[PDB]
Amino acid sequence: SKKEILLDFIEKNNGIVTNKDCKALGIPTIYLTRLEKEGIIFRVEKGIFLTQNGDYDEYYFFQYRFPKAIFSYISALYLQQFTDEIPQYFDVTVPRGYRFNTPPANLNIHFVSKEYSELGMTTVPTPMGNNVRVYDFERIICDFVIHREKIDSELFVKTLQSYGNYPKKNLAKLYEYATKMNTLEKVKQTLEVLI
């Protein structure tokens, strides 16, 4: 039955379950209310439930509420362990014209044209093990090169050096992105000093 499916999913999903997980499995969301009444899970945010062994995940909770926001810049660096800093704010990228409904205050929004909104998007686990959508390193570098003047100079230098030391560069992807984003020659000039 759908209840047995639901309970299997919770056990294998490390103690977090959402309304969207239910809709995806074809299970009425009121089943979560029933499990909450029984004490198996409890509600922490709108549509998000934890077991007694599930944990708060600020990145996953945020992207759950705002699924068009892709973690970018320092959030994308942090989530992929490309920096040692622990940011106290989110950097996200959304399509131009997107407005957040009741965002948190520790948020930097970056807008890009729809054609670029998912270029270099990839999925990685957060520090709490939940999958979120981020920009891969090559797309982060493109962003940094395009937007250098608007970026803290110490962060810019550190990030370029981190890519220089990154042993899993995908230069074909780097060049693909830079061509589409009209920044190939500045990216080639940047790469020259990092390899």
Author numbering: 1 to 195
What does the paper say about this structure?
A recently characterized Abi system, AbiE from Streptococcus agalactiae V/R 2603, has been shown to act as a type IV TA system. AbiE encodes a DUF1814-family toxin (AbiEii), and a COG5340-family antitoxin (AbiEi). The antitoxin AbiEi from S. agalactiae has been biochemically characterized and functions as both an antitoxin and a transcriptional repressor. AbiEi contains an N-terminal winged helix-turn-helix DNA-binding domain and a C-terminal antitoxin domain, connected by a short linker.
To begin, we solved a 1.83 Å structure of AbiEi by X-ray crystallography. There were four copies of AbiEi in the asymmetric unit, forming minor crystal contacts that are not predicted to be biologically relevant, and each copy contains minor variations in domain orientation, indicating some flexibility. Together with previous size exclusion chromatography data, we concluded that AbiEi is a 23 kDa monomer in solution. The N-terminal domain contains three α-helices, followed by three beta-strands forming an antiparallel sheet. The C-terminal domain begins with a single α-helix that is separated from a six-helix bundle by a row of four β-strands, which themselves pair into parallel and antiparallel β-sheets. One face of AbiEi is positively charged, and the reverse face is negatively charged. The positive side corresponds with the site of positively charged sidechains distributed throughout the N-terminal and C-terminal domains, which have previously been shown to be vital for DNA-binding and autoregulation through mutagenesis studies. When AbiEi and Rv2827c are aligned via the N-terminal winged helix-turn-helix domain, the respective C-terminal domains differ in position relative to the N-terminal domains by ∼65°. In the AbiEi monomer, 16 identified residues were clustered at the C-terminus, forming a putative site for interaction. Overall, despite differing captured poses and discrepancy in size, AbiEi and Rv2827c are markedly similar in domain structure, fold and surface charge and are therefore structural homologs.
